[PDB]
Design a protein around this ligand. Sequence first.
Ligand SMILES: CN(C)C(=O)Cn1cccn1
Length: 191
Amino acid sequence: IKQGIREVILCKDQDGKIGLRLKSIDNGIFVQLVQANSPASLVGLRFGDQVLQINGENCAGWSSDKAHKVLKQAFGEKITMTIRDRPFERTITMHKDSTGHVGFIFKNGKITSIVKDSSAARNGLLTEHNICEINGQNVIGLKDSQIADILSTSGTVVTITIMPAFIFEHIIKRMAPSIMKSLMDHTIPEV
Ligand SMILES: CN(C)C(=O)Cn1cccn1
């Protein structure tokens, strides 16, 4: 979560796709989903990102349907976006015990309990929060077992990006879980 407003240059793929769905929240526009192997994924758009501008047009107060339209109407040699990095999210760092726990319970992405004397307790992890990312990798739409697998398989250090469930549930609505599971980019970023 960066306290900054970066700029990205997109470029439509061969099919006129950039691999993005946007959702209106509280009179801004925010990334609802990012397709793997897309211009959006390569330029490093993330779920949760705020789109402040598109081609120097402010997005204040747009509907979703309009932001999608805007993206169609555009000469895709170069589309230029202004992005505030995941405004609604925060990142916690944790360390595992000898027994390879960080110390919480979660369900459907949502942390539901913190365990006394855990690193999760020491670090102030909160319940009623949807897990968005682990060590920089989006996990949204995965199943809990797979998130466990990423956590079980992560180093001694774990890093989680969380979002308040109320806000999370309001972003993902109007989107069917299988799309989230199949299409939402869940890859380590390329370099
Ligand atoms: C932005 N929306 C809802 C649409 O563009 C729908 N559409 C119909 C034909 C081409 N696009």
